[PDB]
Design a protein around this nucleic acid. Structure first.
Lengths: 106, 197, 136, 109, 171
RNA sequence: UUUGCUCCACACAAUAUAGAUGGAUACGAAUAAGGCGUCCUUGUGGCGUCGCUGAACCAUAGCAGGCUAGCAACGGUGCACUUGGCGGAAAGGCCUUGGGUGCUUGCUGGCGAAUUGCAAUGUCAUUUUGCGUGGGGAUAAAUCAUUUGUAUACGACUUAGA
RNA sequence: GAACUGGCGAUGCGGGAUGAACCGAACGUAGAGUUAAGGUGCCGGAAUACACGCUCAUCAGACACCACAAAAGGUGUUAGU
């Protein structure tokens, strides 16, 4: 067809933070479509990929991926907490990111 | 959900719209706000004129050129109210603010596009009926904006052209609705009705 | 000539007015207003749909255009009897509001094979409608 | 090894006899009967990769005949069950993708 | 909180000079048993020469409403402490049960006189069994024959941050 | 100034991305009111219907979407042209005429796909520049130095000089 | 200038924008969970939550320490005797 998307779009909002101290080890993700923790409970444990590009070709590609997963819900509005192998570079606040449907329970 | 969101600023409250839009830019949504001369501020016109005069008094004493700049256009008043809510002195704030452009009227890039509203910042949905409000264009031309009438003339011309568009669109959609109704009650129509479409 | 006003009627709240519970534990059923507590809240009862007789804030219900006869303060046996006599459940079901609700829940209950089926059927219907859009 | 044996069928969408992981699929509600297929031949030793040495490096750059007639045996038994209910061949040939406005927490498969 | 009504019956501790004290009983609106017994001992220390160390509580029982689906009019007599003095007030509330009536009473006093729970004393609450004994206009307004009124200016709260049409406030 | 400059087509390199992954889908006004349809005596008109959110509408099947055969219609859509308009607020876009060409999943068939081995973004976008082709297009000024004094601390300014 | 206690001095951390003393809590290096005091329009992590009222200020008001306001008045408005 014309669409081939097998993931859900999301936005990298910020790190986990207090009013004046942030914590880069936990990122905050807005998954689009979900507006409550009860709907966000479907997406727990799903893999997340941040997909970006670079000028230098490394192993056949100019596209590099950072992997992570959803761990828990955050707040009352469907924001989730996500942890990555290496933390997200904080210039990606507001950048798009992919939530895959695996590991599936359905 | 959208590449660019075009917001019709008519009938909106300045602070509530700015707090919606600033969070949208910080989340990464591109926003363009049109018809900035029709924003509303709650309160009497005399109260908001006194507020702007209190703001207009404030300037750097030893050199007025480096002081706070008092911008007079309604779009720049909205930009001031929004820059107050974005942390504009950082690179993240600058990158957020470059996703925004605010206009008086609807310019020709955006007069053929779709305008939306923000229902949690609409005056008729927020204020109690009976409270007094202002028009940002009237306040801005009271404090020194020079282009209130040329925007009105351009908006009259644009509305005439848009009504000429809408008459043809209404005639076409009435033809399409007539054909859909006559091509209904067939077997595919009843199967789609059983399946929910 | 004669004097003309725009009447501008809307959906009075009184006894016998049928309401739809918007949010809460019922959340989508019908009830009948039994009495009026004050400006902001009323005593309702929904005995056919299983809504218990209760006082409720008017912001948690939506008033429907349906009305039937009740005396004020009627108990639930009389409420159910007059509800069945006026037969307002299928009168609600005949409305386009309830048809919209049923369409929404049907589209929610569709599966992937049914979504494929409605895509095929919509393509066939679009073919015959756009063929009809060439003669007028 | 906790894997699922699947097939396309290969005549329909070109997916051969294969094994997949159960955590990487979505079980739809669409059901066909696979009684009449003798799948006890396949096991974990049926799929062997014949692991490559470290010396054999592909600088620049085939199929088992047993695998291809096993596929031809099973798929002709599947498609007879496919022909009963309509549009299944078209459904299995078409691909799945998420459109704009599809919420997977609300979708039923 | 959401109030409940309890009867609390207590007495003095029995002595040899006087066994069987007189078993005083009071009706308390409170959130739970602990607050109910505390308010019981507070009002008995205001009334008689007794305290909690010198007395005991023989019974506490929740009294729920006899007809929780009848719409009543209640007259409530209240003491409250203002910033300068102590005053008596009589307010009457049209509502479906006693605990909800005193909940709206506490909200009404806190809203209109800035009186707190520690300042309000509930003298009594009683159902007005007959109309035309109702003396306040704000509740006598709702007792008219064929009462009906519209609800102008419907505001529907949205779930999305963007709406694609201008909303209507018809009801 | 040893063949330089610009534009057009693709050919290869480099360069990055504040962050495509079906579609930014166009009345205006009011909200104690409206929208749409229809009728008439065309109005601040009569009658009917709708809202109670976009949970919509359009699009959406095919090797990341192939190679072929037929049926039914004379539709739908893409590409390069082509005729006629309209658009100056930041127009740089919108509509339309005609023919060509490709596809059509509206309907029914035939062949292909494996081995990426149980997942690894599994690579499909647009931004700038350079260097090659081969096809057009055009053949300047400014500054220093000299001079002026309507100018001037010096710069700067205003003049003149084939 | 004294009395009892707790502190700062000698002490970082979360909150009070900011601050020696206030509130919370005292500190090896890390991971996960839950909270205190304080907050949840945006800056800013978190409900433009729910519910009942009150107030429209031609100097509104917005949180302890704390960064001020009184006597006297007002058919402004609300509730009472």
């Amino acid at each position: 067809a014309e669409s081939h998307r097998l993931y859900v779009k999301g936005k990298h909002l910020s790190y986990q933070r207090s009013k004046r101290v942030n914590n880069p080890n936990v990122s905050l993700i807005k998954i689009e479509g979900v507006a409550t923790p009860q709907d966000a409970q479907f997406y727990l444990g799903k893999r997340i990929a941040y997909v970006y590009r670079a000028s230098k070709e490394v192993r056949g590609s100019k596209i590099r991926v950072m992997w992570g997963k959803v761990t828990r819900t955050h707040g009352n509005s469907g924001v989730v907490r996500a942890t990555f192998r290496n933390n997200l570079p904080a210039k990606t606040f507001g950048a798009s990111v992919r939530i895959f449907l695996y590991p599936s329970n359905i | 959900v959208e590449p660019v969101v075009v917001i019709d600023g008519k009938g909106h409250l300045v602070g509530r719209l700015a707090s919606v839009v600033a969070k949208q830019l910080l989340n990464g949504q591109k926003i363009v706000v049109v018809r900035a001369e029709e924003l509303n501020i709650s309160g009497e016109f005399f109260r908001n004129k006194l507020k702007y005069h209190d703001f207009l008094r404030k300037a750097t004493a030893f050199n007025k050129t480096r002081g706070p700049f008092h911008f007079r256009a309604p779009s720049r008043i909205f930009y001031k109210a929004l820059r107050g809510m974005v942390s504009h002195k950082t690179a993240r704030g600058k990158a957020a603010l470059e996703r925004l452009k605010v206009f008086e009227g609807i310019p020709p890039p955006y007069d053929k596009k779709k305008r939306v509203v923000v229902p949690q910042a609409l005056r008729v949905l927020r204020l109690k009926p009976g409270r007094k409000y202002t028009t940002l264009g009237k306040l801005s031309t009271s404090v020194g904006w020079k282009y209130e009438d040329v925007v009105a003339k351009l908006e009259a011309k644009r509305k005439v052209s848009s009504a000429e568009y809408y008459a043809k669109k209404r005639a076409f959609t009435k033809k399409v609705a007539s054909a859909n109704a006559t091509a209904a009650e067939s077997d595919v129509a009843k199967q789609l009705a059983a399946l929910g479409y | 000539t004669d004097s003309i006003v725009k009447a501008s009627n809307w959906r009075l709240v009184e006894v016998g007015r049928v309401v739809l519970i918007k949010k809460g534990q019922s959340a989508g059923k019908l009830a009948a207003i039994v009495e009026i507590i004050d400006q902001k809240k009323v005593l309702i009862d929904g005995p056919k749909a299983g809504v218990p007789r209760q006082a409720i804030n008017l912001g948690q219900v939506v008033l429907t255009p349906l009305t039937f006869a009740l005396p004020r303060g009627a108990r639930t046996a009389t409420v159910s009897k007059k509800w069945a006599a006026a037969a307002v459940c299928e009168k609600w079901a005949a409305s386009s509001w309830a048809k919209k609700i049923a369409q929404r829940e049907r589209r929610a209950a569709l599966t992937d094979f049914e979504r494929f089926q409605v895509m095929v059927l919509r393509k066939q219907k679009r073919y015959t409608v756009k063929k009809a859009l060439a003669k007028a | 090894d906790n894997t699922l044996l699947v097939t396309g069928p290969f005549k329909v969408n070109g997916v051969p006899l294969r094994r997949v992981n159960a955590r990487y699929v979505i079980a739809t509600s669409t059901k066909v009967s696979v009684e009449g297929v003798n799948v006890e031949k396949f096991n974990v030793e049926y799929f062997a990769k014949e692991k490559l040495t470290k010396k054999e490096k592909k600088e620049a750059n085939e199929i088992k005949t047993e695998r291809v007639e096993d596929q031809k045996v099973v798929d002709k038994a599947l498609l007879a069950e496919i022909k009963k209910t309509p549009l299944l061949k078209q459904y299995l040939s078409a691909s799945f993708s998420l459109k704009n406005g599809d919420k997977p927490h609300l979708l039923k498969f | 909180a959401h109030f409940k009504e309890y009867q609390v019956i207590g007495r003095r501790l029995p002595t040899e000079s006087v066994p069987e004290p007189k078993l005083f009983r009071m009706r308390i609106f409170a959130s739970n048993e602990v607050i109910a017994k505390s308010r019981y001992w507070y009002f008995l220390q205001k009334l008689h020469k007794v305290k909690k160390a010198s007395g005991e509580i023989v019974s506490i029982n929740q009294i729920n409403e006899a007809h929780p689906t009848k719409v009543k009019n209640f007259g409530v007599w209240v003491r409250y402490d203002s910033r300068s003095g102590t005053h008596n007030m009589y307010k009457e509330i049209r509502d479906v049960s006693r605990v909800a009536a005193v909940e709206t009473l506490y909200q009404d006093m806190a809203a209109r006189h800035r009186a707190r729970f520690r300042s309000i004393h509930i003298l009594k609450v009683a159902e007005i069994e007959k109309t035309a004994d109702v003396k306040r206009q704000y509740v006598k307004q709702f007792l008219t024959k064929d009462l009906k009124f519209p609800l102008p200016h419907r505001v529907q709260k949205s779930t999305k941050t963007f709406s694609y049409k201008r909303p209507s406030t018809f009801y």
